[PDB]
């Protein structure tokens, strides 16, 4: 058998799960398991494709096998943490900077 | 753009996604495939900083 080369039609005895959009949960489309926010999509899509890779070879859009809709993939891991302190010899107050 | 092509390379493995190898191979047997991906990226990061 092949792995990630054609649209799904067999899979396993696993059941289904209600679609929860606008959340940074774990999704699973045609066996491919990822992590990101299932936001809306306003672009075009050919009526004979499934997955969609951009310039960075990343999973962008994917058609749902049940509702038949285009949903983008955007991970919520976007941010930085940096702490700035004036020193332990002056004051014990810190300032958490969110980049 | 050079670092983007390194993430898509397999470096002599079966794929380039860390969520794909673990979904098809067990951890006690997939340890030889993850080490090839980490070593292949350490040389790319060392060359990038150089």
């Amino acid at each position: 058998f092949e792995l990630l080369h054609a649209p799904a039609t067999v899979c396993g005895p696993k059941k289904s799960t209600n679609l929860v959009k606008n959340k940074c949960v774990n999704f699973n489309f045609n066996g491919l398991t990822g992590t990101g926010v299932l936001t809306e999509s306003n672009k075009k899509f050919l009526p004979f494709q499934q997955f969609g890779r951009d310039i960075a070879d990343t999973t962008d859009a994917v058609r749902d096998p049940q509702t038949l809709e285009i949903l983008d993939i955007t991970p919520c891991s976007f941010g930085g943490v940096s702490v700035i302190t004036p020193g332990t010899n002056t004051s014990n107050q810190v300032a958490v900077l969110y980049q | 753009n050079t670092l983007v092509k390194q993430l898509s390379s397999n470096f002599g493995a079966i794929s380039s996604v860390l969520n794909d190898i673990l979904s098809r191979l067990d951890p006690p047997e997939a340890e030889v495939q993850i080490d090839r991906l980490i070593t292949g990226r350490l040389q790319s990061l060392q060359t990038y900083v150089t």
Binding site: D54, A56, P75, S77, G80, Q99 | L3, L7
Partner: peptide, 24 residues
């Protein structure tokens, strides 16, 4: 509104990544 002149503003006319670890 800027602190530049007509010649300085002409120089500026001539001239997704963070999801992987490329921050500016």
């Amino acid at each position: 509104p800027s602190k530049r002149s007509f010649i300085e503003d002409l120089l500026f006319n001539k001239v997704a990544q963070k999801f992987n670890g490329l921050t500016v």
